[PDB]
């Protein structure tokens, strides 16, 4: 598997280099978010009301990306539908605050529709 792994690595490397060179706001946003472990669980939709589900690893990521019922990601606004902790258990937007934050089982999963 090693020649194949070497090619695979060289290809992934070139790919992210090309992505850097493109220097696109949206791609940079989803790549950067992914480096901090904020990752989409499904394909990012391009149409209204369509469901995006992404993992939010912690409260810093959370508050950087979320204001009110609004989630901002891949250069777009998404209207938050639900949040659920790691127990599948729902979580209100008001329970997510600096005080109550360590009381939550992270990561959260945000489900939201495109604006």
């Amino acid at each position: 598997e090693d020649k194949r792994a070497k090619v695979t690595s060289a290809m992934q490397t070139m790919l992210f280099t090309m992505l850097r060179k493109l220097d696109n706001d949206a791609l940079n946003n989803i790549i950067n978010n992914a480096r901090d472990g904020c990752v989409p669980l499904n394909i990012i939709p391009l149409t209204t009301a369509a469901k995006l589900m992404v993992v939010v690893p912690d409260y810093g990521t959370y508050k950087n990306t979320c204001d009110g019922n609004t989630f901002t990601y891949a250069s777009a606004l998404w209207e938050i539908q639900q949040v659920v902790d790691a127990d599948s258990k729902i979580v209100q937007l008001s329970e997510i605050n600096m005080d109550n934050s360590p009381n939550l089982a992270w990561p959260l999963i945000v489900t939201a529709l495109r604006a």
Binding site: L15, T17, L19, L22, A26, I30, V39, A74
Partner: protein, 79 residues
């Protein structure tokens, strides 16, 4: 312009995905192929980049190991 660059990149990405064995899902592979074709046929950068956000999102949602921090480490460590 940068249109040829995005398009070229979409072809590489579709490859990276195929290399990750994304073909074992007929549904997901068909989805990737379609986004790739849409990018190549895009007449405006906007359409090309939006379709590209969707396609790239396939690779990022794969827990697998595209693992990015590791590539960056490789990149940093050489220049």
């Amino acid at each position: 312009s940068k249109m040829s660059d995005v398009k070229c990149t979409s072809v590489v990405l579709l490859s990276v995905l195929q290399q990750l064995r994304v073909e074992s899902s007929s549904k997901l592979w068909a989805q990737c192929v379609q986004l790739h074709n849409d990018i190549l046929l895009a007449k405006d950068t906007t359409e090309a980049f939006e379709k590209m956000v969707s396609l790239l999102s396939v690779l990022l949602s794969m827990q697998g190991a595209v693992d990015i921090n590791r590539l960056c480490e490789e990149m940093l460590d050489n220049r």
